[PDB]
């Protein structure tokens, strides 16, 4: 989850 969120949120 967090890996996906962090990637998403940085973009």
């Amino acid at each position, epitope marked *: *989850y*967090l890996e996906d*969120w*962090i990637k*998403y949120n940085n973009q």
Partner: antibody
Framework: EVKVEESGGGLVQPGGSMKISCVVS????????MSWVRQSPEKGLEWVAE??????????YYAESVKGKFTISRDDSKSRLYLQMNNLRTEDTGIYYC??????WGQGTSVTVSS | DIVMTQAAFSNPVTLGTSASISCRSS???????????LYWYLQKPGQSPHLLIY???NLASGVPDRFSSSGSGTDFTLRISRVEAEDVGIYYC?????????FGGGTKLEIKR
């Protein structure tokens, strides 16, 4: 500011269906994960469904409560999120919010399931 | 699933004094990036929730400096340092570390007058 506005609530009988939606303005809708969160006395704030982006093949996620009953979808061209809600029970009564995690909530649209 | 625990009510607070609203989570919300993914929302009567704090202690844009927050990975506290009458409402905690997203049951602020 960013504005989230739901519509489509009303009454339906148990075992029936509803389809609600929200339009989001003030940002580029297609670039955001979007969710539905409902509110009721018994269960308080309850996240029910979520959808990611075209680049994620529109991956969807559901709370166990509603798996098999609800389908979330998005039309990026209309900046619109949908929730198709089938085989409803009285406990599906509540105020339904679009929530753009983690920043933005709509005004809510009310859904009553009753005979 | 993470359980977020909040008391339904707080001790009534006199205007101009400090109120503390607590929350705890059943799992640590501290991530390996050093961020604790704990959020606070306020829902005023007749309204939707609105974001106050993100990542444990950061104020959302336009939120007054009267609001602050800290915590561990599991126990968190929102402070309203000089309460005003308009702050009445229900304050909710939420995590952002996994799905399903879950919320605390909400703590209603009562003003003492």
């Amino acid at each position: 500011e960013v504005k989230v506005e739901e519509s489509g609530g009303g009454l339906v009988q148990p075992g029936g269906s509803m389809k609600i939606s929200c339009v989001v303005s003030g940002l580029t809708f297609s670039n955001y994960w979007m969710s539905w969160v409902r509110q009721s006395p018994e269960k308080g704030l309850e996240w029910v469904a979520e959808i990611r982006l075209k680049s994620d093949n529109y991956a969807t996620y559901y709370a166990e409560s509603v798996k098999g009953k609800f389908t979330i979808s998005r039309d990026d061209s209309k900046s619109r999120l949908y929730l198709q809600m089938n085989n409803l029970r009285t406990e599906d009564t509540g105020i339904y919010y679009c929530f753009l995690p983690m920043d933005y909530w709509g005004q809510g649209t009310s859904v009553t399931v009753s005979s | 699933d993470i359980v977020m625990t909040q008391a339904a009510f707080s001790n009534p607070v006199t205007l101009g004094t400090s109120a503390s609203i607590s929350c705890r989570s059943s799992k640590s919300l501290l991530h390996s990036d050093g961020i604790t993914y704990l959020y606070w929302y306020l829902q005023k009567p007749g309204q939707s929730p609105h974001l106050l704090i993100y990542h444990l202690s950061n104020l959302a844009s336009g939120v007054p400096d009267r609001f602050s927050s800290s915590g561990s990975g599991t126990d968190f506290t929102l402070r309203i340092s000089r309460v005003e009458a308009e702050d009445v409402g229900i304050y909710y905690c939420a995590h952002n570390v996994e799905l399903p997203r879950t919320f605390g049951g909400g703590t209603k602020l009562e003003i003492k007058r």
